[PDB]
Design a protein around this nucleic acid. Structure first.
Lengths: 213, 101, 91, 239, 136
RNA sequence: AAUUCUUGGACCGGCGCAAGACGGACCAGAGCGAAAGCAUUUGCCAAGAAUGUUUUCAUUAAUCAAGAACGAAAGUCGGAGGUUCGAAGACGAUCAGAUACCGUCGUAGUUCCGACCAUAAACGAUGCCGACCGGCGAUGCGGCGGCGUUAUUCCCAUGAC
């Protein structure tokens, strides 16, 4: 003697000031009933949303994540959780006859926000090269894997979480390796290829409202 | 009596190689000996590359390909006719079949 | 002149107790009564005195090791695990 | 075993084995004491250790009896309190010390003088932390892990006299002398080896039991004998 | 079931986790996040014969009945996250992938972002079946 | 098909935690090792072949009865550990009968630390050291000669072609 899609009222979702479009979508939860509140459970989602739809006209392969840490009332504000690239895009990249060069790190920002960053690179094969392979020797390779690491920390260590999310919209870190590896071995398809949050600093409510203002 | 020079497997600097599970059966097969294939494939092949394009959102869009790496044991290969038996000189031709269309 | 073809200290037991306990006693009743180099002075006279409680009879220093040998085996890497959590915190 | 002829044999035994108290030192800062002898006690195949701390309100020298942690030796220094350095035989509260480190003679109540992990070859490792509540998790020897009160302490290392279950006791006497320095308990007579009136299991022609050797938890005395409240029974395979 | 929206220029998005192994068909519409669930139906609900529950017709009989119950709350657009059995078994998608996705392109719904979300390992627990194969 | 799980909320969807395995794609008729063999990032510790040398010793070498070091996978003896798989066993289907294939569970075993055991189509079914007797197209390591693009811009020489 019941219809289960009456006890569900349509609220709204938001994104921070660093990305372009403000309005993502909507989400539904049950009312204040028995002993559970409609603003207690609605405080830790993950929306694995792209960038193209979040912006005007971008490269779409990057994704993002935006958890709910605060609830306004008919509006769910959001907080940082992760990056990733698209399955398809990354599978395309890996090819036979070329080395691949991964490398990772656990940095911290100045504000609490602790972060694990992955990386990746592929040796390029030039225009007039007859040679089939394009392989790179061990000791060639581990001087890239130390540069990849050196460059990631420098550009996060010294400045806060609000400034290292505006270095991943194109991929700041990405092309800045490409430039500094050339004279060791030339590689092309450089990325951060996953960025993952390991810890958070305690919730202060006014901290989140200069990101929406 | 000997029939092949390189005896079913690419290996001349090693002695021992690592095993791989046949993706039709589940048999162990030596990496080198295996028959491998690589598949790249849009999620729309020929029929369904028509219905979605007129009832889709984005102005000028491209759909993703689907990338698999297969691995066959010898009789898994032969049953599913990815490969044939062959005549004695013919055998030799490591020249792969022509992919024009 | 070699006097026994396989029974170490365990000639002191003859036919008693059965084969595989006499083998099992040979590995503990040779290590307990040995001597060890005192790391402090350098000499070759560590030596047990009771269950897991050892004594150099030159520089009169006294240690707590294992019941039947002078280091216990993961107390050798309990020292190399506490030393390594002195690295994690101090920065 | 409820009295008279049984009660534990206490004369040649050398002290009761504890931690310090606690006081303003252990509680706001740190204190140092020196080791003066490692030392054997009976009824307890593990060594103790005297430690001359100096009393901080009168001229004196206090003197304690910890449970000796392997790797300790004589003369060496023991520095302890809420600040003191995490190395070996140096005491400080679970609140402070990091995850991964091993402990001995651990406390359960804040201030109770150490009740857990003092028999030969026993630890009480630290897992996790929650500092609103002030509570801590500690995996004890039996697989389980107590929630514990975050101000309650333990000397660092693993307990001395390690590896005693190894060696086969061979002769029956070596038992006696083991169990002649504890309590009236040994050459143990089976239950089927008693008449009708002396054990419920024994009686008649053969030497059988008759009744199943599992029994209710809620029996009375005289009966609760055997495998008590027995969750399962047989040769234990798998896990 | 009446969502407040601008009547002449906004379609309410979503996501569907399209599971496609060889022995059953599944379709499962959820929110943007994926946490709740709005309209779920299998090939087993529709067709009744053990061997032909995952067949391309037993994958299309389910997808129309998604969009029947998916047009009464009033959803138009949807994101997509297709599967294939995965893990340490086959990663090629089954026969309820295109006949489940192309059916809702005819049954009054819009199509958005597509990809694969098989489980895939970096490497694996030993696989079911012997060293010697699964003879047949 | 059924044994097996399910309104006692199974399957598919989420956000958490926990352990016990294995190191995908990159992976090649590429590499190193005395043979078995060896693929996640850093730190450290002894070893190695090749090339380079107008350095030193001066025949110190080759092959090897007896004797010695190492020796996949299974199999043993005592702990530590038990996710997946999985000899023995229990059922469901199959067949004239199946104590065989397949299907549902599952012990010994699968994984570490300690010591035994000494065999495999342990394969190139092909003894080790030495001289000699054709032509080419690749390839890996080291050294040398030579036009011209590219990188560090400012070019010295080091990388990349």
């Amino acid at each position: 003697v019941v219809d289960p899609f009456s006890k569900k009222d349509w609220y709204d979702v938001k994104a921070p000031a660093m990305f372009n479009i403000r309005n993502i979508g909507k989400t539904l939860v049950t009312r204040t009933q028995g002993t559970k509140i409609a603003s207690d459970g609605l405080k830790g989602r993950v929306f694995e949303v792209s960038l193209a739809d979040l912006q005007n006209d971008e490269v779409a392969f990057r994704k993002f994540k935006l958890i709910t840490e605060d609830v306004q009332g008919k509006n769910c504000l959001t907080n940082f959780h992760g990056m990733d690239l698209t399955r398809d895009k990354m599978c395309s990249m890996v090819k036979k006859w070329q080395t691949m060069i991964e490398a990772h790190v656990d940095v911290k920002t100045t504000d609490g926000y602790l972060l694990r960053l992955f990386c990746v690179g592929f040796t390029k094969k030039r225009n007039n090269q007859i040679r089939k392979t394009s392989y790179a020797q061990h000791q060639q390779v581990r001087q890239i894997r130390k540069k990849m690491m050196e460059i990631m920390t420098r550009e996060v260590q010294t400045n806060d979480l609000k400034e290292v999310v505006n270095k991943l919209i194109p991929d700041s870190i990405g092309k800045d390796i490409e430039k500094a590896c050339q004279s060791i071995y030339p590689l092309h398809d450089v990325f951060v290829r996953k960025v993952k949050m390991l810890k958070k600093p305690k919730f202060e409510l006014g901290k989140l409202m200069e990101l929406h203002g | 009596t000997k029939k092949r020079r390189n005896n079913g497997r690419a290996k001349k600097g090693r002695g021992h190689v690592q095993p791989i599970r046949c993706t039709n059966c589940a048999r162990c097969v030596p990496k080198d000996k295996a028959i491998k294939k690589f598949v790249i494939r849009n999620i729309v092949e020929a029929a369904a590359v028509r219905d979605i394009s007129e009832a889709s959102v984005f102005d000028a869009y491209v759909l993703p390909k689907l990338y698999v790496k297969l691995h066959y044991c010898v009789s898994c290969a032969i049953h599913s006719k990815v490969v044939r038996n062959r005549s004695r000189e013919a055998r030799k031709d490591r020249t792969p079949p022509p992919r024009f269309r | 002149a070699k006097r026994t073809k396989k029974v170490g200290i365990v000639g002191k037991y003859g036919t008693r107790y059965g084969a595989s306990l006499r083998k099992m006693v040979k590995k503990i009743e040779i290590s307990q009564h040995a001597k060890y180099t005192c790391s402090f002075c350098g000499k070759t006279k560590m030596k047990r005195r009771a269950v897991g409680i050892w004594h150099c009879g030159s520089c009169m220093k006294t240690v707590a090791g294992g019941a039947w040998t002078y280091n216990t085996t993961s107390a050798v890497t309990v020292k190399s695990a506490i030393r390594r959590l002195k690295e994690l915190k101090d920065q | 075993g409820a009295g008279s002829v049984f009660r534990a044999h206490v004369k040649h035994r050398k002290g009761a084995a504890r931690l310090r108290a606690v006081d303003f030192a252990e509680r706001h800062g740190y204190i140092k004491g020196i080791v003066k002898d490692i030392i054997h006690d009976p009824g307890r195949g593990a060594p103790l250790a005297k430690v001359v701390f100096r009393d901080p309100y009168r001229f004196k020298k206090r003197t304690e009896l910890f449970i000796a942690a392997e790797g300790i030796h004589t003369g060496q220094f023991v520095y302890c309190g809420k600040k003191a350095q995490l190395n070996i035989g140096n005491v400080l509260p679970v609140g402070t010390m990091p995850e991964g480190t091993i402990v001995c003679c651990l406390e359960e109540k804040p201030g109770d003088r150490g009740k857990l992990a003092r028999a030969s070859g026993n630890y009480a490792t630290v897992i996790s932390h929650n500092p609103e509540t002030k509570k801590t998790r500690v995996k004890l020897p039996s697989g389980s892990k107590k929630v514990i009160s975050s101000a309650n302490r333990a000397v660092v290392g693993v307990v001395a006299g390690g590896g005693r279950i190894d060696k086969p006791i061979l002769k029956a006497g070596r038992a006696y002398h083991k169990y002649k320095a504890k309590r009236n308990c040994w050459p143990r007579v089976r239950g089927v080896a008693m008449n009708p009136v002396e054990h419920p299991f024994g009686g008649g022609n053969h030497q059988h039991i008759g009744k199943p050797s599992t029994i209710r938890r809620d029996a009375p005395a005289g009966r609760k004998v055997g495998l008590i409240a027995a969750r399962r029974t047989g040769r234990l395979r798998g896990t | 079931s009446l969502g407040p929206q601008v009547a002449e220029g906004e379609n309410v998005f979503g996501v569907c986790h399209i599971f496609a192994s060889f022995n059953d068909t599944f379709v499962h519409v959820t929110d943007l996040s994926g946490k709740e669930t709005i309209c779920r139906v299998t090939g087993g609900m529709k067709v009744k014969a053990d061997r032909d529950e995952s067949s391309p017709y037993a994958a299309m009989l389910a997808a129309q009945d998604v969009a029947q119950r998916c047009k009464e709350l009033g959803i138009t657009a949807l994101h997509i996250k297709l599967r294939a059995t995965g893990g340490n078994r086959t990663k090629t998608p089954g026969p309820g992938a295109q006949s489940a996705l192309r059916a809702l392109a005819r049954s009054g719904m819009k199509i958005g972002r597509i990809e694969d979300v098989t489980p895939i390992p970096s490497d694996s627990t030993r696989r079911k079946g012997g060293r010697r194969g699964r003879r047949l």
